[PDB]
Design a protein around this ligand. Sequence first.
Ligand code: V23
Length: 152
Amino acid sequence: MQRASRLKRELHMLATEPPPGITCWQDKDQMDDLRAQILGGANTPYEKGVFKLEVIIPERYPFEPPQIRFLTPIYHPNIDSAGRICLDVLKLPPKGAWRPSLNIATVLTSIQLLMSEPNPDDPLMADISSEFKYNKPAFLKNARQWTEKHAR
Ligand SMILES: Cc1cc(=O)n2[nH]c(C(F)(F)F)nc2c1
């Protein structure tokens, strides 16, 4: 009942005040099986791609974070080839940053920010991370080509 009331409010806010570039909605009729979309940001290599994500709300929400993975392939130091995301707010403390005062909208915004600003210090993709650090022009070209191939 606690989780239910919280999800109703989140779905209302996602429907009426979505963050710029972000959409999140119910796949069907269950408030804990959600989908989202993040628009590729301008001045990023993902520009003019559209990235779909799966947003699964666990039983203990809001005390456990949403489980979010990219469905659209993306070329990024912190996102693996299955769409898993390495991001602090998707993880529980002490290492992670999730807390019940965050919500689906804030963490989708954090993923959007991660797309703009990767964290080569916490890589999931070692070869992409090294390319991002030491050969940024190649990283940007590869990230654009992957966006053309899979997100457009
Ligand atoms: C988009 C959005 C804006 C906003 O202010 N909130 N607040 C909550 C909360 F508190 F219900 F979890 N969800 C949201 C979502």
